[PDB]
Design a protein around this nucleic acid. Structure first.
Ligand SMILES: [K+]
Ligand SMILES: [O-]
Ligand SMILES: [Sm+3]
Ligand SMILES: [Sm+3]
Ligand SMILES: [Sm+3]
Ligand SMILES: [Sm+3]
Length: 341
DNA sequence: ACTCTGCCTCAAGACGGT
DNA sequence: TGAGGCAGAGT
DNA sequence: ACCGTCC
């Protein structure tokens, strides 16, 4: 993420944010940060503070969400491609260490909340310990294949590869909550795309070109702004928040120039600041080749889906079979069969 | 008065019978 | 792999 | 729309 970027845009570039009704998206393709949505399901999809699971102890919360949400999207003629995170860049090592530190603390506090019986505390610390694993990813991929829904493995950060897919015109937008997708250059970011049958949060599109126009910046300058706001890849300058950062960038145009003009006593910069490395990472990230794989939405394998979800994962046969019928008919409505010439 | 930091707390899904 | 509220302190 | 339940 980028610290306070969403709020900053709402305050200083409101026209970059557009809202449309879900009925307007029929036929559109979108790239989805899979690892992130699996995470959301593991955290939220609970009964008695416990994830859903089959009788043999295997978690099924993530399969539950991925199955049903994907179908609801397709019912609206929205065609998702799911993108999975790869190996993190070295620059992120610091941030990851911080996370593992927090996990170690959370593990202690979980234990003591248990010897204290504090059930609501236990639930909190258990949520803090939720972690998307390789098995979670492998099960979702397996499921998506059976559903006929495409997915890709990013070489590194999935947001970066989502952005690259939008730039190449392979999908219309990147659908994620992580704003660093814009820092990676995604022309369009959709937030709150769940296509939920219960409404709530309006669908928001962020348009990068509108953002750059409103702030009066090019993409290089925008990335420098984000670094100053605070990213995962390097430190920012203490004392410099969203307000002073926009002004410094609009005036000095670059962190390099900002540092030369800043008084080393009033606003000292981080020692051995890696802003240059991060800048390079946001602008030239390692990404999949968007011309490589042709995205297709295939017919769902109904019988194998039933064996997997019902036979193995113990989902209701009625709900699953009903889901597959809906998915199949909705695909038929929004997708053209392949043609040979 | 405007700005920023540190610390707190909170929320985080989908289906279907009613 | 946040967000927003609040008190206190820096500009 | 609410809310008990989903696995
Ligand atoms: K800062
Ligand atoms: O992020
Ligand atoms: Sm990210
Ligand atoms: Sm990521
Ligand atoms: Sm079994
Ligand atoms: Sm098993």
């Amino acid at each position: 993420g980028i610290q306070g970027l969403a709020k900053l845009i709402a305050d200083v570039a409101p026209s970059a944010i557009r809202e449309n009704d879900i009925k307007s998206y029929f036929g559109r393709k979108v790239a989805i940060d899979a690892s992130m949505s699996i995470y959301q399901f593991l955290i939220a999809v609970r009964q008695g503070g416990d994830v859903l699971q089959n009788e043999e102890g295997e978690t099924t919360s993530h399969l539950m969400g991925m199955f049903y949400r994907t179908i609801r999207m397709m019912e609206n003629g929205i065609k998702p491609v799911y993108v999975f995170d790869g190996k993190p860049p070295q620059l992120k090592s610091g941030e990851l260490a911080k996370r593992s530190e927090r996990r170690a603390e959370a593990e202690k506090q979980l234990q003591q909340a248990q010897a204290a019986g504090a059930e609501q505390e236990v639930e909190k610390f258990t949520k803090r310990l939720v972690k998307v694993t390789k098995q979670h990813n492998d099960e979702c991929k397996h499921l998506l294949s059976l559903m006929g829904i495409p997915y890709l493995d990013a070489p590194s950060e999935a947001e970066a590869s989502c952005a690259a897919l939008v730039k190449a015109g392979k999908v219309y937008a990147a659908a994620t909550e992580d704003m660093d997708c814009l820092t990676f250059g995604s022309p369009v970011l959709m937030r709150h795309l769940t296509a939920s049958e219960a409404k709530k949060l309006p669908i928001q599109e962020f348009h990068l070109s509108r953002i750059l126009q409103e702030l009066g910046l090019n993409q290089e300058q925008f990335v420098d702004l984000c670094i100053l706001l605070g990213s995962d890849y390097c430190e920012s300058i203490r004392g410099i928040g969203p307000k002073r950062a926009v002004d410094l960038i609009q005036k000095h145009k670059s962190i390099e120039e900002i540092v030369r003009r800043l008084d080393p006593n009033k606003y000292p910069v981080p020692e051995n600041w890696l802003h240059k490395e991060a800048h390079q990472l946001f602008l030239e990230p390692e990404v999949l080749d968007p011309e490589s794989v042709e995205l297709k939405w295939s017919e769902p394998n109904e019988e194998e889906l039933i064996k997997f979800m019902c036979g193995e994962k113990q989902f209701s046969e009625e709900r699953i079979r009903s889901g597959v019928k809906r998915l199949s008919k909705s695909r038929q409505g929004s997708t053209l069969e392949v043609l040979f010439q």
